[PDB]
Design a protein around this ligand. Structure first.
Ligand SMILES: C[C@H](CCC(=O)NCCS(=O)(=O)O)[C@H]1CC[C@H]2[C@@H]3[C@H](O)C[C@@H]4C[C@H](O)CC[C@]4(C)[C@H]3CC[C@]12C
Ligand SMILES: [Ca+2]
Ligand SMILES: [Ca+2]
Ligand SMILES: [Ca+2]
Ligand SMILES: [Cl-]
Ligand SMILES: [Cl-]
Ligand SMILES: [Cl-]
Ligand SMILES: [Cl-]
Length: 124
């Protein structure tokens, strides 16, 4: 679920700001997306969006109001290591994996302050 993704991210990135409140970034980090990702971090978000897009196409899964973000799962965090619980059902596991891949991806990408709150209407 969305609130778990936020924690999972703070797990992969211990950081120095807990609920620092995430702002939109680039062309895909945020609700929706359009055009082409502008950088590494943005690509991480596009991949995530595409993973959720795949989720919506699972013949065996149908989420509340068709939003994968509503699907709660179970995961654990260690020294920045993320592990999706094997007891998650198939639909939950697919979502947990999308989130885990993204958290790791985010933790490796540079943060270009010039892309924060980008004017998506013109550059995306
Ligand atoms: C982990 C990433 C970096 C955080 C960061 O270093 N911010 C520093 C800002 S500043 O330089 O201090 O201004 C941030 C960049 C944009 C963030 C995303 C956007 O805020 C959009 C989404 C917001 C939702 O609450 C959580 C998922 C959601 C999809 C966020 C995942 C975390 C992202 C991908
Ligand atoms: Ca998005
Ligand atoms: Ca269902
Ligand atoms: Ca669930
Ligand atoms: Cl989002
Ligand atoms: Cl958007
Ligand atoms: Cl369901
Ligand atoms: Cl349903």
């Amino acid at each position: 679920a969305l609130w778990q993704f936020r924690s999972m991210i703070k797990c992969a990135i211990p950081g120095s700001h807990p609920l620092m409140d995430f702002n939109n970034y680039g062309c895909y980090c945020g609700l929706g997306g359009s055009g082409t990702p502008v950088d590494e971090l943005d690509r991480c978000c596009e991949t995530h969006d595409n993973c959720y897009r795949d989720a919506k196409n699972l013949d065996s899964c149908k989420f509340l109001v068709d939003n994968p973000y509503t699907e709660s799962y179970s995961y654990s965090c260690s020294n920045t290591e993320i592990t999706c619980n094997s007891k998650n059902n198939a639909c939950e596991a697919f979502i947990c994996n999308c989130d885990r891949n993204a958290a790791i991806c985010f933790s490796k990408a540079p943060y270009n302050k010039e892309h924060k709150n980008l004017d998506t209407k013109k550059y995306c």
